Amino acid sequence: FRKMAFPSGKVEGCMVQVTCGTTTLNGLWLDDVVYCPRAVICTSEDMLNPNYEDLLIRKSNHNFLVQAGNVQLRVIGHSMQNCVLKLKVDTANPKTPKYKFVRIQPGQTFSVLACYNGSPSGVYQCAMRPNFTIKGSFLNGSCGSVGFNIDYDCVSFCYMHHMELPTGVHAGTDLEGNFYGPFVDRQTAQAAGTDTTITVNVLAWLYAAVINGDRWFLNRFTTTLNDFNLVAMKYNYEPLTQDHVDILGPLSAQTGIAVLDMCASLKELLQNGMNGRTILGSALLEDEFTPFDVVRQCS
Amino acid sequence: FRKMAFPSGKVEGCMVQVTCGTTTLNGLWLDDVVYCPRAVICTSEDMLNPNYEDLLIRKSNHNFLVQAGNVQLRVIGHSMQNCVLKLKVDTANPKTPKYKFVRIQPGQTFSVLACYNGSPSGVYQCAMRPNFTIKGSFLNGSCGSVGFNIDYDCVSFCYMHHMELPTGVHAGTDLEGNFYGPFVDRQTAQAAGTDTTITVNVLAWLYAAVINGDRWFLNRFTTTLNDFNLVAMKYNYEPLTQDHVDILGPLSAQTGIAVLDMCASLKELLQNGMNGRTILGSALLEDEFTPFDVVRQCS
């Protein structure tokens, strides 16, 4: 039961360094476009109350230094899309993989290739919390690192790191520059909402327990989806959506245990204790394995 | 504070598929040699009691099918070094990185690139247990996957996966073909020695907890090295050497907490337990981060 990241090679060849003035961060080089956080055009003084439209007007193509390692790529156009800058460069990246941009839902997991100054440093797996933050490990110069999933031959880019919040959590955007959650890219007072437990992922973990023969928690009861959702909220668990019920389908089929029967088992675990017993060796429930993460064990 | 794996791109470009008869597994292609576990020449019947010298003399070059994606490599020659087969091929790998073969010690960590049929599937960080096994995620066909660290420009290969033990833990060799631990590449029931907890790594992880604002376990007391070691061995923890104390120095310096002071906190956790409290979100004492791993992620 390890947290497995996707192999990073396809993303490593797309990482570059973007500098404006003295501010350097990471960018993503796909075909002849470099994507990076628009905060790169800010001085430390600008960040307090930036006017990005104004700041960008006073920038030319020749104010941007884009580097692949030590090699400069000339910028031949620039535009702003929401909170990301798009820099058109003179060279199409020969390492561009098949890719697509995806906006994920809270609870989904992805790998993050943590980079400093365009140089890949490490890969880890994380989940998007329901309060749209990530409990992760990339402060200090990691702005612009991206999160991704690999869907056969295709890299789905889903996250671009922008900043750290006061409580140590990280916030960012999708690759269209739209923030996940109610945050803005300025050094102002910002707080995330209260974190909740990702119910669909706890269910995926209970199915994984059953698949491996750990099944003491199954009970003889069932529940309705509405009954379960109203009880879940009293324990700071996320309510289930119809999409969550659908993505648990393969695990329900594999084990023969209906989704709502498993909800009834979890509900009893929430009201009573776990009676000192473990599940998959753990006294705590895990909520950062998705249904798809779990099926990466049967295959 | 997550488990961070090394970027896998330099190793992904070296993975190939190797087939002999009906047996297919993963190989590592560096320069003009493919390294893979010698068990690839065995049938199901051979693995009961393989005489590897005899089996190899009975094979010819064309009995070996090597595939790098869709390109088939021609085998020129073949030789055995301990438990690894070295297949010479007529083409060098142009994506060969700067590399070294190293034998690691228990307690040290590395990244594993899990592959199936020569295709990279996931990357994760693990530790070599004191009993020379690794607790990992290896399904059928994962044989021949490698473990590695990266030192700037250099990939240090330290592990090649060979077999799963009846308890689910994994066993393998270095890249010279010598097993880690008292295991043999034969299909017979094999147990490992008793495992122990890697004390210096637990201490590193407690420093990480402190760095990250998790301090409930600290106390004002101190202990001596020998008095700590007496308690450690009682609880199946590795004893602490003076070398271990030196390696923890940078963490001691950054937190203002002397090593023997932290040892006194660990001793209390060993004796009283954690009593339903968590550290860095975990209910168990984590021992698969080295002091270097913690320093790398906390500076």
Give the closest-approach CA distance of A183 to chain B in angstroms: 23
Closest chain B residue to A123, measured at CA: B5
Q: Cα-Cα-Cα-Cα dihedral of B259, A135, B217, B265, to 10°?
A: -20
A297/B137 Cβ within 8 A: yes
Instruction: Look at residue A266 and give its three-state secondary structure.
Output: helix
For residue B56 the two structure tokens come to 């190899």
Rounded CA-CA distance B165/B185 in Å is 11
Let me know: does A160 contact A144? Beta carbons within 8 Å.
yes
Q: Alpha helices, DSSP H only, in chain B? A: 9-12, 52-57, 199-211, 225-234, 242-247, 249-255, 259-272, 291-297
Using the beta-carbon criterion (under 8 Å), do A6 and B122 form an inter-chain contact? Answer: yes
Chain B residues in contact with A10 (beta carbon < 8 A)? 9
Buried b (16+ CB within 10 A) or exposed e, A73-82: bebeebebee
Tokens of B49: 């009691």
Pairing of strands A154-164, A98-101: parallel
**Residue numbers in A near B169 (CB within 8 A):** none
**Residues A9, B5: C-beta atoms closer than 8 Å:** no
CA nearest neighbour of B41 among B86, B74, B101, B72: B86
Q: Which residues in chain A are contacts of B124 at CB distance < 8 A?
A: 2-5
Partners of A79 in the β-ladder: A86
HSE-up of residue B50 (Cα within 13 Å, Cβ side): 22
- CA B22/CA B40 separation, integer angstroms: 9
| A226–chain B nearest CA distance, Å | 31
Q: How far is CA B87 from the centre of its chain?
A: 24
- Determine whether the interchain pair B9/A13 forms a contact, defined as Cβ–Cβ distance below 8 Å: yes
Residue A68: partners with Cβ closer than 8 Å, 6 or more residues away: A16, A17, A29, A118
**Which SS3 state, helix, strand or coil, does residue A262 take?**
helix
Residue with tokens 């660290």: B149
Query: For the domain that residue B62 is a member of, what is the CATH number?
Result: 2.40.10.10
Residue A7, chain B, CB below 8 Å: the answer is yes
- Inter-chain touch B121–A168, beta carbons under 8 Å: no
CA-nearest of A267, A248, A268, A266 to A258 is A248
B265 CB burial (10 A radius; 0-12, 13-18, 19+) = buried
Whether residue B216 lies within 8 A of chain A, CB to CB, comes out as no
- Amino acid residing at B185: D
The approach used to solve this structure was X-ray
- DSSP class per residue in B94-106: TTPPEEEE----T
Residues A181, A129 contacting (CB under 8 angstroms) = no
Query: Residue A245 is part of a domain; what is its CATH number?
Result: 1.10.1840.10
**Is some CB atom of chain B closer than 8 A to the CB atom of A282?**
yes
The string of DSSP codes covering B194-242 is PP-B-HHHHHHHHHHHHHTT--TT--S----HHHHHHHHHHTTBPPPPH
CA B119/CA B141 separation, integer angstroms:
11
- Alpha carbon dihedral A46, A51, A57, A61, in 10-degree steps, equals 50
Name the token pair of B230: 């007496």
In this structure, are residues B200 and B107 in contact, taking their beta carbons and an 8 Å threshold? yes
Q: Is B238 within 8 Å of B129 (Cβ atoms)?
A: no
Range of the domain at A269: 199-295
Under 8 Å between Cβ of B147 and B12: no
Where are the extended beta strands (E) located within chain A?
A: 15-20, 23-30, 33-37, 64-68, 71-73, 75-81, 84-89, 98-101, 109-116, 119-127, 146-151, 154-164, 170-173
Among residues A49, A136, A39, A111, the alpha carbon closest in space to that of A80 is found at: A39
Tokens of B100: 């070294």
Cβ neighbours around A90 below 10 Å, total: 12
Contact A54, A61 (CB under 8 A): no
* B186: β partners: none
Nearest residue on chain B to A115, alpha-carbon basis: B7
Cα separation, A287 vs B8, whole angstroms = 26
